[PDB]
Symmetry: C3
Subunit: 114 residues, 3 copies
C-alpha cells in the first residue's frame, strides 16, 4: 500500500508522529505488515476545494488488492478521521482516490510483484 | 473533478485568482457545481520535457465520468489555453492524463461516492 | 513516456544532469525518441517506507504502450539502478507504479493523441 496526502495546511501544523500513525493505521486497515507500506505527506500546497482555499486534502491510496466497495468506505472513515484530528481538515474537504494495482504493474527492488 | 498541474515555472508567475479561475472553468467544462471541483497547482518543479527545461507542465484530470474521447479533446484545448495564457507554457510542452474513476473508488466525507 | 520520482533525498543531493540522464535512459528503454519523454523529480519530501524515513522513493512511469509484465521487470532494474547510484537510495526502498495509458486519455498541444 502507498498513501499520499497533498494539503494546503502548513508544514508546521503536521504533528510529530503523523507518518508513523498513517503507517500503523494503514497496516491495521489493509492487513499488510508495516514493512510493505509507504506514506508521503505534502503540505504547504496551492490548492482549492469547492472554490475555497480553506484547509483541504487530495489523497490517493494505491494497493495490490484490498480495494473494493466496503473496504474503501472503511478506509475513507479512517483516513478522514486522521486528517481531521491531526491536520485539522474537515472530512467534506477531502478526496481520496483508490487504485487497485495489478502486481505486475508495481516495481520494487529490481523486479515487480508479479 | 480533480485537476493537478505540476510545472517548472516559478511561483511568482502564478497569477492571483488562478485557482479560482481553474475551478470556475472546470465547473463549466464538466457541467458540475463548483462545490465538487478540486484544483492543485505545483510550481517551481524540477522537470524536463523532451530533454529541455524550458517551461512545461505535467497535469492530470480525474473525474467520476465525463472522461472520454471527445470530452478529452475539448478539455485539452481549454487547459492548454489556460496554461499558455496564464503561465506562458507552450501547448506542445504540456501533457495531461485523463482518468475516469469509479464512484466506489473515490472517497469523500468519511465514505465514498458509491 | 512520463517518469516521476518523489523522494526524501534533499535537493542538493540530486546531481546535475539527472533529468537528462533519465530522459536518455528512458528513450533507450522504451524505444521512444527523447522528444516524447517527460521527467519530473521531487526531492525534500516528507516520506516513510516501512515506517522508516531513511532515503526512499515513490515513482510512476506512464506510457502509451511499452508496459507489460516483462518490460516492467526490466524497467525496475534500470530505474532502481539509477536511483541507487545517483540518489543513494536502497532498491528495497523504491516502489514504481507502471501505467499503460490509452492515447485518447493523453492530452498534448490542444488535443489528444487519439
Ligand atoms: C502496497 S502497494 N504494498 C506493496 C505490496 C507488495 C506485495 C504484496 N503481496 S503479493 C507479492 O502481491 O502477493 C502486496 C502489496
Ligand atoms: C471530481 S472527481 N468531483 C467529485 C465527483 C463526485 C461525483 C461525480 N459524479 S456522480 C454521477 O455524482 O457520481 C463526479 C465527480
Ligand atoms: C509518453 S507517455 N509519451 C507520449 C507519447 C505520445 C505519442 C506517442 N505515439 S502516438 C502513435 O501518436 O500515439 C507515444 C507516446
Amino acid at each position: 500500500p502507498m498513501f499520499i496526502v497533498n494539503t494546503n495546511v502548513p508544514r508546521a501544523s503536521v504533528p510529530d508522529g503523523f507518518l508513523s500513525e498513517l503507517t500503523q493505521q494503514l497496516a491495521q486497515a489493509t492487513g499488510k505488515p508495516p514493512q510493505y507500506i509507504a506514506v508521503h505527506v505534502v503540505p504547504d500546497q496551492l490548492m482549492a476545494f469547492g472554490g475555497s482555499s480553506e484547509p483541504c486534502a487530495l489523497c490517493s491510496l494505491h494497493s495490490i488488492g484490498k480495494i473494493g466497495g466496503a473496504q474503501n468506505r472503511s478506509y475513507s472513515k479512517l483516513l478522514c478521521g486522521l486528517l481531521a484530528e491531526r491536520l485539522r481538515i474537515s472530512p467534506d474537504r477531502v478526496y481520496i482516490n483508490y487504485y487497485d494495482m495489478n502486481a505486475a504493474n508495481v516495481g520494487w527492488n529490481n523486479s515487480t510483484f508479479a
